[PDB]
Design a protein around this ligand. Structure first.
Ligand SMILES: [C][C]S(=O)(=O)N1[N][C]C2=[C][C]=C(OC3=C(/[C]=N/[O])[C]=C(C(F)(F)F)[C]=[C]3)[C]=C2[B]1([O])[O]
Length: 264
């Protein structure tokens, strides 16, 4: 018997096999969840990444900036899940920020056009997705998004930090809307993870300062932190997807090795 036995969950944000969403999807399927996966612009290549998952899963096209995609998403999911069946979970693992708003680039030199695009994708889309999917969610359901603790400023992450701050605020309002359906809405604030996205930033002064953040994180974390292992994060997301945190919503769960509770 698995944690998510007989639950229908939509997982978005799977770009590579190193994406956090892939490990969330992997662990979810290991725990008995029936999945619906979304992607964009490389569905042939994405499906082949998806094929490495334990179980087969339908793949739907979703650009969270496309209003037509969002307006038809709910229906397209139903034609895949089956009529009379609803979703029990939605995982939002989508974030983006142009180079000008991250890395070694001066914080002031990021034009708003780039920042607005990042915030649309990283923060506003969380509400867009909730708006589209809540009608086809069962009571007791769970919406989960991804987060990186933005309560304090930091190097390199720059404007992505701001987009995460907005996301945290958006989540609290999504929770108000989700409550009417009996649905919870939460974020998982993870410690630093070596996704291909972040791995690129490290290589592409800033990269050294990222290493300083990574090193300091593991030391600070009372139980340690492995940036190469996304599994503890994925299990945390699955925990929120289950029925074992049923009184938690509009909230943030920190899967960071306990680093945010330690100063030094
Ligand atoms: C899920 C996709 S996402 O786009 O929306 N996203 N959300 C959560 C999230 C959580 C942790 C992350 O890892 C880091 C690292 C990693 N170092 O190895 C370094 C820094 C810093 F501050 F040093 F630059 C920040 C986050 C990345 C992401 B994220 O921005 O990819």
């Amino acid at each position: 018997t698995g944690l998510l036995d007989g639950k229908r969950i939509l997982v978005s944000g799977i770009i590579t096999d190193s994406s956090i969403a892939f490990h969330i999807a992997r662990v979810a399927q290991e725990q008995g969840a029936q999945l619906v996966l979304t992607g964009f612009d490389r569905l042939r290549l994405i499906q082949r990444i998806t094929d490495r998952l334990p179980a087969k899963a339908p793949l739907l096209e979703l650009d969270v900036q496309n209003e037509e995609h969002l307006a038809s998403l709910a229906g397209r999911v139903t034609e895949a899940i089956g009529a009379g069946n609803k979703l029990d979970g939605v995982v939002h693992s989508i974030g983006f920020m142009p180079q000008t708003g991250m890395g070694i680039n001066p914080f002031f030199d990021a034009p708003y056009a780039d920042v607005s695009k990042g915030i649309h994708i990283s923060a506003y889309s969380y509400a867009s997705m909730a708006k589209a999917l809540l009608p086809i969610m069962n009571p007791g359901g769970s919406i989960v998004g991804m987060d990186f603790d933005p309560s304090r400023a930091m190097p390199a992450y720059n404007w992505m930090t701001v987009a995460k701050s907005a996301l945290e605020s958006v989540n609290r309002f999504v929770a108000r809307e989700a409550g009417k359906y009996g649905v919870r809405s939460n974020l998982v604030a993870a410690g630093p993870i070596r996704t291909l996205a972040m791995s690129a930033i490290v290589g592409g002064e800033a990269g050294a300062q990222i290493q300083l953040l990574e090193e300091g994180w593991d030391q600070r974390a009372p139980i340690g932190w492995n940036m190469k292992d996304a599994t503890p994060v994925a299990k945390t997301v699955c925990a929120l997807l289950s029925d074992w945190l049923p009184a938690t919503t509009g909230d943030i769960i920190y899967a960071d090795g306990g680093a945010h509770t330690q100063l030094l």
